[PDB]
């Protein structure tokens, strides 16, 4: 999703379901390759 | 980059809702039967027997 080859339009926004696996978010918070990162209700690093 | 100023202000204005308007809070704490008394209430003492 974050590194997709060709994204979709805005009216044609794609959705990808994720489940039954582990998700390492700490690598994203420390990636330093994003213009903005905002999490509502929960801290970004507390997602782990 | 991942650094934030923890101090933020309140939106106390005359147009916001009661969920945001300023509420003058006054928290009264005290200890009871822990030391000799200093404060008392509007009472009337009397003689001894």
Q: Pick from A25, A26, A8: which is nearest to A16 by CA?
A: A8
* Solved using: cryo-EM
**Resolution as reported, in Å:** 3.1
The angle at the Cα of B22, spanning B20 to B25, to the nearest 5 degrees, equals 125
Classified as helix, coil or strand, A46 is helix
Other beta carbons within 10 Å of A44: 14
Report residue A36 CA to chain centroid gap: 11
User: How many CA atoms does the CB half-sphere of A41 hold within 13 Å?
Assistant: 1
> CB of A30 within 8 A of CB of A48?
no
């Amino acid at each position: 999703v974050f590194n997709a080859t060709r994204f979709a339009s805005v009216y044609a926004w794609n959705r990808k379901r994720i489940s039954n696996c582990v998700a390492d978010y700490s690598v994203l918070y420390n990636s330093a390759s994003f213009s903005t990162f905002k999490c509502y209700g929960v801290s970004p690093t507390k997602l782990n | 980059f991942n650094c934030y100023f923890p101090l933020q202000s309140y939106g106390f204005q005359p147009t916001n809702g009661v969920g945001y308007q300023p509420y003058r809070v006054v928290v009264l704490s005290f200890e009871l039967l822990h030391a000799p008394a200093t404060v008392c209430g509007p009472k009337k003492s009397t003689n001894l027997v």
